[PDB]
Write a protein that binds this ligand. Structure first.
Ligand SMILES: O=C(O)[C@@H]1O[C@@H](O[C@H]2[C@H](O)[C@@H](NS(=O)(=O)O)[C@@H](O[C@H]3[C@H](O)[C@@H](O)[C@H](O[C@H]4[C@H](O)[C@@H](NS(=O)(=O)O)[C@@H](O[C@H]5[C@H](O)[C@@H](O)[C@H](O[C@H]6[C@H](O)[C@@H](NS(=O)(=O)O)[C@@H](O[C@H]7[C@H](O)[C@@H](O)[C@H](O[C@H]8[C@H](O)[C@@H](NS(=O)(=O)O)[C@@H](O)O[C@@H]8CO)O[C@H]7C(=O)O)O[C@@H]6CO)O[C@H]5C(=O)O)O[C@@H]4CO)O[C@H]3C(=O)O)O[C@@H]2CO)[C@H](O)[C@@H](O)[C@@H]1O
Ligand SMILES: O=C(O)[C@@H]1O[C@@H](O[C@H]2[C@H](O)[C@@H](NS(=O)(=O)O)[C@@H](O[C@H]3[C@H](O)[C@@H](O)[C@H](O[C@H]4[C@H](O)[C@@H](NS(=O)(=O)O)[C@@H](O[C@H]5[C@H](O)[C@@H](O)[C@H](O[C@H]6[C@H](O)[C@@H](NS(=O)(=O)O)[C@@H](O[C@H]7[C@H](O)[C@@H](O)[C@H](O)O[C@H]7C(=O)O)O[C@@H]6CO)O[C@H]5C(=O)O)O[C@@H]4CO)O[C@H]3C(=O)O)O[C@@H]2CO)[C@H](O)[C@@H](O)[C@@H]1O
Ligand SMILES: *[C@@H]1O[C@H](CO)[C@@H](O[C@@H]2O[C@H](CO)[C@@H](O[C@@H]3O[C@H](CO[C@H]4O[C@H](CO)[C@@H](O)[C@H](O)[C@@H]4O)[C@@H](O)[C@H](O[C@H]4O[C@H](CO)[C@@H](O)[C@H](O)[C@@H]4O[C@@H]4O[C@H](CO)[C@@H](O)[C@H](O)[C@H]4NC(C)=O)[C@@H]3O)[C@H](O)[C@H]2NC(C)=O)[C@H](O)[C@H]1NC(C)=O
Ligand SMILES: *[C@@H]1O[C@H](CO)[C@@H](O[C@@H]2O[C@H](CO)[C@@H](O[C@@H]3O[C@H](CO[C@H]4O[C@H](CO)[C@@H](O)[C@H](O)[C@@H]4O)[C@@H](O)[C@H](O[C@H]4O[C@H](CO)[C@@H](O)[C@H](O)[C@@H]4O)[C@@H]3O)[C@H](O)[C@H]2NC(C)=O)[C@H](O)[C@H]1NC(C)=O
Ligand SMILES: *[C@@H]1O[C@H](CO)[C@@H](O[C@@H]2O[C@H](CO)[C@@H](O[C@@H]3O[C@H](CO)[C@@H](O)[C@H](O[C@H]4O[C@H](CO)[C@@H](O)[C@H](O)[C@@H]4O)[C@@H]3O)[C@H](O)[C@H]2NC(C)=O)[C@H](O)[C@H]1NC(C)=O
Ligand SMILES: *[C@@H]1O[C@H](CO)[C@@H](O[C@@H]2O[C@H](CO)[C@@H](O[C@@H]3O[C@H](CO)[C@@H](O)[C@H](O)[C@@H]3O)[C@H](O)[C@H]2NC(C)=O)[C@H](O)[C@H]1NC(C)=O
Ligand SMILES: *[C@@H]1O[C@H](CO)[C@@H](O[C@@H]2O[C@H](CO)[C@@H](O)[C@H](O)[C@H]2NC(C)=O)[C@H](O)[C@H]1NC(C)=O
Ligand SMILES: *[C@@H]1O[C@H](CO)[C@@H](O)[C@H](O)[C@H]1NC(C)=O
Ligand SMILES: [Ca+2]
Ligand SMILES: [Ca+2]
Lengths: 511, 516
């Protein structure tokens, strides 16, 4: 009811307007929010309005079980790699993300590709099975339009023990068209083999004023184009049988948001109906499908990409310049990352456990080699103060000692040593053991008393600490709580507990 | 539309009562204060109220000039050692503080003694000269008043030459069962009493004080025994030792009164608001001699030399001032048995001794300072103060713990002492100090960033040495850290000191390092 406006002098240098009722002073949240860097808003419920304050914005993952290498990967069941605006698109040829974080030109970032695979792996274990509608098997168990000038038939293919739909259509015609009409699901899948150049295109009804947009999957290696209401993805020659799987929601959003910058422009556009599929050129088509999700095809696109792109040193070279900050020498394209090696390993190990295909395990085993060589010999190892081995997310000179990347490097070694067995696992066992000793000793250097630091650049360069933003702080917690389920050391449990309290505004005691 | 109570849920786990007007929410300072550990109050101006918020308490010292060893010692012009409640009293025998911080029994803490001296030294340079009233010289300068002696039957007094120190002197004989001989003083403005004393027999020199507590009269007895302090009714007793040879006795009656009335068997003196408002008279009992009786606003230098003299006389053969109390730094550090050394003690002692040397040119002071570097050379476990961080950086330990503790501020004090000494001792004698300073300053520059949280400083590196939460430095240590670094930034031109001072000052106003 009754109050009194009062001047509030802040640190003797700015005045704000507060309110007073007797002895109690009330300060405007507008100030509190900005001055303390906190969060809150009024939430309206039925018959009750309530202001709701948060020290931080991120959340910690509620672990349902101890970590195991064949299970979900940490909290990645909730990751969403493809909406990240630093993902320019999902490659047509490779079926994996292309990053633009550190250059508008685009590049395959092995970390991003592995996360793509591990998140989809994790959602395969946690989400409900998808609806799968089948539109075309060409067998004896929703028809096609064939304009004059074109042709279609059911033909056997002994190489792949099924019937198959042949199509011939000039690239100057309407093409041959199959009516789909799906309202609910947006993952399109089909087996394809071209004899000549061509395209397979999908018409979408969209939420932007009921307009049709068309996505063309063209038989070239061009990445992505967008003109008016046509989006084009190059999917390569596809002259041998392959299953093409695309997420039309993502393919539409990335097209419409195409940008010459490092970030996709935001869009609200969604597809509301998969109208039809249009084939041009000469070729063959089978098992045409629309599904709610296709997690496994994504996981194997990442896994296959990692196998095929590993170098003979066992590394995934990162083909972009990385400038970590004033004081660190710039990393020329080709550098390795312990986070990439670890995340790749976690991916390949899971591919191996699913398939028993030893090419996956062989790729994983090779991937430990860079952990053995120092950064200046094109490895990822750094040594803290001539005493503790570390595996560098960014193998900088001087060394950088990024915490979260290191922990990811260790979870990979863990995945591998538990999967390869006693003899084959030896090197990974040894790198893990040395790493975990380093981690336990060095954790306290990342603890500010009300947060965490991202890296040790303050010490390595003589500068301000690089405080970890809250989404890295919760990553730190997520990583440590996972390690606490496969290593019984008290230190991990104590730090997890303290670092969680920091999310709620707890502080270490001052003297 | 209007202003209105609203429930405010904090971090999903407790609801407080705030206020709302439309889209603006207002939160009670009662919550803000506790939740964020900040400060403020409504301060009343003429007609007019204002709330005044502070991120911190404690101020940074406004350094007027580059540090030099003969000048003020950092910010100590504003230190007040004697009112600290961990100071049981000023020793009658020694003229220096006794601490009870880590034991109610009391002990001479060299750090406290050095601070006593360095603050008085600093105030000598910054304060106005004192008024000095002279009540008795026994000369022919004592032609006309002050007379003012009362000599009861049973007693006797005379002006007597003393060839041994070239002046006239007041002889007194009074039995210690009588009221004694009494000199009327009657000073209302100044409270430092001073007199030259020589007893032949046991005796006492006592001062009657009018006080602010309901006009009441208290007497402070300076007795010829070694008893520390006693208080009964309105009598306070300080033992000043035999005083059978000439010495100048100098006492602060404000301090001596307050420590008397506040006597306690605990580690803290009871607070009092009692002040003396008049030094009414001085009473001599026993047989002896008295000269140069004086009352002064201040006597900074007598304090500075009492500290300096105490340090010379109490140094051990390893050059140390052993700390004769058990010190348990916390869970994970072994307990330190009485006799441990402190690099802070060594440095502060050296800063004191160097100043005593520069004033007097008495090489005893310089030689005592030079000896005081020895403990810097030996590791904690061989009864020194050296520690080594990760087999790489020498450090000088405030608390020579196992494991090592790496307390920041004591280290910096250890370095300013070495600086004072290396600048003063000369090329040849300074060699060792120069070497310890150079190695220490390298260590400081390398290790500073480990004490920086991004919104404060840490006191020590126990988090790393024991695997536990950081020991965040409270704000009065945070400003000490700044004061120390800003001083170092005037004797070493390294950018790092200036960049850190700038950042660490911004933390006092709620600035933070950038997050990624
Ligand atoms: O389904 C939904 O619900 C979904 O909701 C939303 O999505 C949410 C998720 O659901 C949710 N999941 S949860 O389980 O429910 O919690 C959650 O997921 C996110 C997690 O919170 C997050 O932790 C996680 O992050 C990943 C990250 O995505 C991944 N990257 S990857 O795509 O590449 O794979 C990976 O990060 C790696 C990797 O190496 C780098 O990408 C990363 O790079 C760091 C830098 O190292 C760091 N450098 S530092 O500053 O030196 O420390 C820092 O650099 C930034 C700085 O911030 C910036 O200040 C600075 O600016 C430059 C500037 O660009 C320069 N310009 S230039 O000169 O022109 O070049 C110039 O001006 O200089 C300055 C600097 O001086 O530099 C930039 C920069 O260079 O990039 O930050 C970089 C990026 O963070 O670091 C590493 C690493 O691990 O450290 O792994 C991490 C961790 O696993 O994944 C999130 C996710 O999945 O999205 O929250 C989501 C909500 O946020 C969604 O919104 C809904 O739509 C959807 O519906
Ligand atoms: O005349 C006036 O104007 C007066 O004003 C008011 O006084 C103010 C004064 O004016 C002002 N000066 S200024 O220039 O204007 O700024 C200012 O002076 C104070 C300084 O701000 C302050 O930094 C400084 O502190 C001294 C300290 O006094 C020294 N101690 S002493 O022995 O010489 O007397 C010395 O400290 C050393 C020493 O070794 C130890 O005493 C001390 O110990 C620490 C422990 O290390 C620490 N351990 S922990 O593991 O970190 O926890 C901790 O321990 C305690 C814990 O807090 C407790 O929770 C637990 O249970 O145990 C406790 C324990 O004691 O074991 O804290 C200990 C105590 O600090 O630390 C050492 C060190 O590291 O340096 O040197 C320091 C720094 O120089 O001196 C102040 C001073 O009085 O001069 O501010 C004052 C206001 O206080 C006054 O109100 C007014 O009446 C007066 O007229
Ligand atoms: C997580 O990932 C797991 C593993 O990938 C996944 O479970 C799998 O789900 C897929 C569906 O995408 C299943 O594939 C089907 O396999 C059928 C035979 O497979 C046997 O083998 C496995 C072991 O390897 C057994 O455990 C299993 O019980 C089976 O006996 C196969 O018949 C299916 O093929 C039909 O459907 C496809 C389109 O999906 C189509 O292209 C074909 O032409 C074919 O025709 C249609 O048949 C179905 C009857 O099945 C009929 O409904 C339909 O009407 C026919 N067509 C027409 C025109 O009428 C198919 O390939 C696979 O068996 C599952 N594996 C396991 C281990 O469970 C989870 O669903 C994923 N979860 C999440 C959340 O992502
Ligand atoms: C910082 O500290 C310094 C000194 O440590 C102070 O400056 C000194 O002030 C004192 C007085 O407080 C001076 O000492 C001497 O006083 C004698 C005065 O004689 C009368 O007073 C005595 C005692 O009170 C009576 O018994 C007697 O009846 C007299 O009536 C002088 O006789 C001395 O003169 C000579 O001393 C030295 C020679 O060694 C020289 O410095 C003098 O110039 C002179 O030759 C002397 O005056 C003394 O003058 C001051 N010393 C210095 C070095 O300047 C500051 O006051 C103090 N400041 C603060 C703020 O504390
Ligand atoms: C009360 O106060 C007065 C001072 O206000 C004080 O009288 C002064 O005492 C000093 C020292 O006793 C006298 O100075 C001495 O004078 C002789 C000769 O004039 C000097 O030779 C002495 O020097 C000695 O020290 C040096 C070696 O260490 C050498 O110089 C030499 O070898 C000597 O050993 C010394 O300077 C001073 O003259 C008087 N002043 C007056 C006005 O009388 C008195 O001592 C104080 N009362 C008490 C009880 O102390
Ligand atoms: C479209 O999907 C169907 C699956 O629904 C694919 O047909 C399947 O093809 C595989 C091999 O191509 C057959 O497995 C093979 O079986 C033979 C013996 O029968 C054996 O020699 C091989 O080792 C292998 O096990 C599978 O039985 C077959 N299933 C059916 C029901 O036909 C078809 O290939 C897909 N179309 C295209 C073009 O990929
Ligand atoms: C002050 O009084 C004490 C007596 O209480 C005197 O000290 C004694 O002196 C004799 C030698 O003369 C010693 O053998 C005794 O052991 C001492 N007794 C005590 C209790 O200490 C002291 O000498 C007197 N002071 C003066 C200056 O004469
Ligand atoms: C597709 O077109 C390119 C030239 O633009 C050609 O090299 C290639 O042979 C064509 N593919 C087939 C299968 O004919
Ligand atoms: Ca078929
Ligand atoms: Ca005289």
């Amino acid at each position: 009811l009754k109050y009194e406006e009062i001047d509030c002098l802040i640190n003797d240098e700015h005045t704000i307007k507060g309110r007073r009722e007797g002895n109690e002073v009330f300060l405007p949240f507008t100030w509190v929010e900005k001055y303390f860097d906190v969060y809150g808003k009024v939430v309206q419920y039925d018959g009750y309005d309530r202001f709701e304050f948060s020290h931080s914005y991120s959340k910690v993952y509620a672990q349902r079980a101890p970590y195991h290498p064949d299970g979900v990967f940490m909290s990645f069941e909730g990751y969403n790699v493809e909406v990240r605006d630093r993902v320019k698109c999902i490659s047509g040829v490779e079926g994996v993300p292309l990053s633009t974080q550190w250059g508008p030109q685009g590049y395959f970032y092995p970390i991003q590709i592995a996360q793509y695979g591990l998140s989809h792996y994790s959602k395969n274990l946690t989400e409900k099975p998808p609806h799968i509608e089948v539109y075309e098997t060409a067998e004896d168990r929703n028809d096609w339009t064939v304009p004059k000038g074109c042709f279609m038939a059911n033909v056997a293919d002994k190489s792949r023990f099924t019937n198959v739909k042949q199509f011939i259509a000039p690239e100057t015609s309407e093409g041959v068209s199959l009516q789909l009409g799906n309202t609910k699901d947006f993952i399109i899948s089909f087996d394809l083999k071209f004899l000549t150049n061509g395209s397979v295109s999908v018409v979408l009804e969209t939420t932007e004023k009921n307009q049709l947009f068309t996505i063309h999957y063209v038989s070239n290696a061009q990445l992505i184009a967008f003109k008016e209401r046509d989006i084009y993805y190059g999917i390569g020659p596809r002259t041998s049988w392959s299953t093409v799987t695309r997420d039309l929601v993502t393919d539409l959003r990335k097209g419409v948001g195409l940008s010459n910058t490092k970030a996709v422009k935001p869009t609200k556009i969604m597809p509301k109906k998969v109208v039809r599929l249009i084939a041009k050129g000469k070729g063959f088509l089978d098992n045409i499908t629309i599904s709610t999700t296709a997690h496994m095809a994504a996981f194997f696109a990442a896994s296959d990409w990692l196998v095929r792109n590993q170098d003979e040193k066992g590394g995934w070279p990162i083909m972009v310049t990385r400038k970590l900050g004033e004081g660190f020498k710039s990393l020329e394209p080709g550098w390795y990352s312990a986070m990439a090696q670890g995340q790749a390993i976690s991916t390949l190990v899971r591919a191996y456990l699913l398939t028993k295909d030893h090419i996956f395990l062989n790729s994983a085993l090779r991937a430990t080699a860079p952990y053995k060589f120092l950064s200046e010999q094109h490895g990822v190892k750094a040594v803290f103060m001539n005493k503790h081995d570390w595996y560098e997310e960014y193998p900088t000179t001087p060394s950088s000692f990024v915490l979260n990347g290191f922990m990811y490097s260790l979870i990979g070694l863990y995945d591998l040593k538990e999967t390869a067995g006693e003899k084959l696992g030896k090197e990974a066992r040894s790198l893990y053991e040395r790493g975990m000793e380093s981690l336990k000793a060095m954790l306290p250097l990342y603890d500010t008393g009300s947060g965490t630091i991202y890296d040790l650049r303050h010490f390595m360069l003589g500068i301000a600490p690089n405080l970890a933003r809250w989404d890295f702080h919760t990553t730190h917690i997520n990583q440590l709580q996972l390690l606490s389920t496969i290593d019984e050391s008290p230190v991990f449990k104590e730090f997890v507990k303290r670092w969680k309290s920091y999310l709620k505004g707890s502080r270490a005691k001052h003297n």
